[PDB]
Each structure stands twice: as C-alpha cells, then as structure tokens.
Amino acid sequence: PKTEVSVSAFALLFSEMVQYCQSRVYSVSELQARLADMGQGVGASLLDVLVMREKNGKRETKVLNILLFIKVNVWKALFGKEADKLEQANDDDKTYYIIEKEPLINAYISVPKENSTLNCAAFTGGIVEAILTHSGFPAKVTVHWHKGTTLMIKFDE
Amino acid sequence: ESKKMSSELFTLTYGALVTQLCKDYENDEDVNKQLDRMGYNIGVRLIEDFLARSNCHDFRETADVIAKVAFKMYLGITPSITNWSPAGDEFSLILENNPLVDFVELPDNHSALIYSNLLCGVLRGALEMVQMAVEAKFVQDTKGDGVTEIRMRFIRRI
Numbered sequence: 001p002k003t004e005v006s007v008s009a010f011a012l013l014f015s016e017m018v019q020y021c022q023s024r025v026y027s028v029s030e031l032q033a034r035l036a037d038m039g040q041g042v043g044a045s046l047l048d049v050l051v052m053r054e055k056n057g058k059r060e061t062k063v064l065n066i067l068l069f070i071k072v073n074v075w076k077a078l079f080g081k082e083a084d085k086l087e088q089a090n091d092d093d094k095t096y097y098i099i100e101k102e103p104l105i106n107a108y109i110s111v112p113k114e115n116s117t118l119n120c121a122a123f124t125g126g127i128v129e130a131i132l133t134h135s136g137f138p139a140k141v142t143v144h145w146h147k148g149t150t151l152m153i154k155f156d157e
Numbered sequence: 158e159s160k161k162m163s164s165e166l167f168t169l170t171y172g173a174l175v176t177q178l179c180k181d182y183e184n185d186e187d188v189n190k191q192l193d194r195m196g197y198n199i200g201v202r203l204i205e206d207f208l209a210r211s212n213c214h215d216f217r218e219t220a221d222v223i224a225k226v227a228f229k230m231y232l233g234i235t236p237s238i239t240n241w242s243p244a245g246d247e248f249s250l251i252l253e254n255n256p257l258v259d260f261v262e263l264p265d266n267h268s269a270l271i272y273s274n275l276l277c278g279v280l281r282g283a284l285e286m287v288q289m290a291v292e293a294k295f296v297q298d299t300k301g302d303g304v305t306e307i308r309m310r311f312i313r314r315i
C-alpha cells in the first residue's frame with residue numbers, strides 16, 4: 001500500500017541518527033563515515049526492490065546504464081525527483097559525479113539551516129555505494145562541496 | 158501547514174538505523190532501550206511541530222488526536238482506537254500493518270527485538286511535553302500476528 005509521509009518523519013528521524021553517530025565519534029569526518037555505513041547497510045535492499053519493480057528483474061552490466069539507474073531510478077525513489085546532474089570527470093575515465101544544486105536535506109525542513117553539512121549526502125553516498133558494488137561495480141563513493149553538493153563516484157581500475 | 162514525501166526514504170532510513178543498532182549492540186534488548194530513548198528525543202521535538210501546525214483535554218480525546226490527526230499527519234495512516242478502560246485510563250491502537258516497515262529486512266536472528274519500538278518513545282516524549290505522563294508498548298506485531306497493536310495508559314498529570 002503506497003503511502004505518503006510527512007517530510008518531517010524523515011527529517012526528525014535523520015536528525016536523531018546524526019546525533020546518535022555524533023555521540024560515539026571524534027570528528028565530523030568520522031560522523032559522515034558512520035552515516036555512510038548506515039547507508040551501505042540498506043543500499044542492497046533498495047537495489048533489489050527497484051530492479052524487480054522497475055527493471056523487469058534485470059541488473060545492469062555496463063557503467064553508463066548503472067549510473068543512469070542511480071540518477072533516475074534511485075534518486076526518484078528516494079527523493080521524489082531525478083538527480084540534477086550526472087557527469088564524467090574530463091580528467092580521468094574512472095570518475096563520475098552526481099551533482100545536486102541544493103543539499104539533499106533542505107527539501108525536508110521548513111527553513112534551510114544557517115550552516116550546511118554533508119550528513120545526508122554521506123548517508124546517501126553509502127546507499128549509492130552499496131547499490132554499485134552489489135551490482136558488480138567495485139567503487140568508492142565520497143561527498144563534497146563543489147557547484148552544490150557532490151557525490152564523487154570512483155570505479156576501481 | 159505540512160509538506161509531504163513518499164514512504165520509501167523514511168522506511169528505508171529507519172531500516173538503516175535498526176540494522177546499525179544491531180551491530181553497535183550485541184544484545185537485541187539493549188537495542189530496544191536505545192530505540193525508545195531515540196524515539197523519546199524525537200517525540201520531544203515532534204510535539205512542538207505538531208501543536209504549531211494544527212488545533213487535547215481528557216485521555217479519550219488524546220487518543221483521537223493521536224490516531225486520527227497526528228498518526229495521519231506524520232506517518233500517513235490512521236490506527237483504530239479500541240479496548241478502552243472503565244475510567245478513560247488505557248486504550249489500544251490498531252494497524253492492519255507495521256508503519257515503519259516495508260522491503261527493508263534484517264536477518265531474523267532477533268527474537269526479543271521490537272523493530273518499531275521507537276514509536277513508543279515518540280509517543281511518551283510527545284505526550285510528556287503536553288504535561289502528560291503516559292506509557293506505550295507493543296502487544297502485537299505484523300511477529301506473525303494478525304495486526305499491530307500499541308497499548309497506552311495514562312499514568313499521571315504533570
């Protein structure tokens with residue numbers, strides 16, 4: 001039964017998770033790593049549900065196809081919209097980017113926070129990472145600020 | 158005033174927390190404690206958002222506001238209020254299905270685990286903010302049961 005939840009259910013929940021991780025961590029860098037961990041833990045579940053539901057049960061074997069799965073299928077399922085941009089680094093054939101114009105968290109809170117963070121991006125990056133590795137593409141996903149919030153996707157050589 | 162979103166992310170995210178708490182804690186039962194404490198923290202913040210974005214008195218009305226408004230406004234559903242107590246002391250919330258569950262599953266080795274325990278803390282924390290000291294807890298979970306039931310009882314004013 002498809003349901004619609006208040007943007008607050010998530011916000012409030014995520015905010016606690018952030019605090020949870022922050023209570024057993026030393027640095028923001030470690031905080032994000034823990035969040036990325038929680039994300040990776042469930043990435044696979046989302047991969048299977050989207051494949052069986054939107055891809056007739058066929059996983060991807062090519063790089064371009066899996067990246068689009070992220071930008072379209074995965075991003076829509078999670079945030080109700082498609083990712084703003086999908087790009088390849090012009091410097092190296094093994095790096096790609098998922099660029100969001102606004103931090104992911106801002107769509108779930110009345111007023112954007114004065115100071116921005118990469119907590120939702122880290123969490124999400126862990127999800128995207130589980131999705132990629134579990135589909136057969138060993139990769140490393142990181143997050144940072146540049147032209148908005150970026151998910152850097154690096155495939156292993 | 159209230160913006161909406163699809164369940165997917167929320168249930169997915171919550172599944173992440175539960176899956177992680179199962180790693181940070183070796184005991185299925187200490188997870189329950191943490192989930193409740195965590196729910197409590199949210200309930201304390203939630204009550205505010207709720208109150209501000211809408212329009213209780215006795216415990217019978219509180220059950221209405223909870224199952225018909227609050228539960229509908231946040232989790233997008235409406236539990237049934239059945240099995241009251243002679244003096245408007247205790248009642249039950251019914252659900253044809255678990256509100257925090259869908260497609261995210263944990264390996265089953267967790268018999269003493271109350272998957273959605275967080276909801277109990279949320280309730281307690283929220284009500285406690287409106288000067289009400291109550292108690293929440295599960296007594297049926299869609300755990301091989303027919304439906305999900307949360308028992309609540311007014312303990313004392315504040």
Ligand SMILES: *C(=O)CCCCCCCCCCCCCCC
Binds near residue numbers: 012199223279284
């Ligand atoms: C009467 O004075 C006001 C009563 C307000 C009760 C609010 C109860 C909130 C619990 C709703 C459950 C939603 C769970 C959301 C989890 C993120």
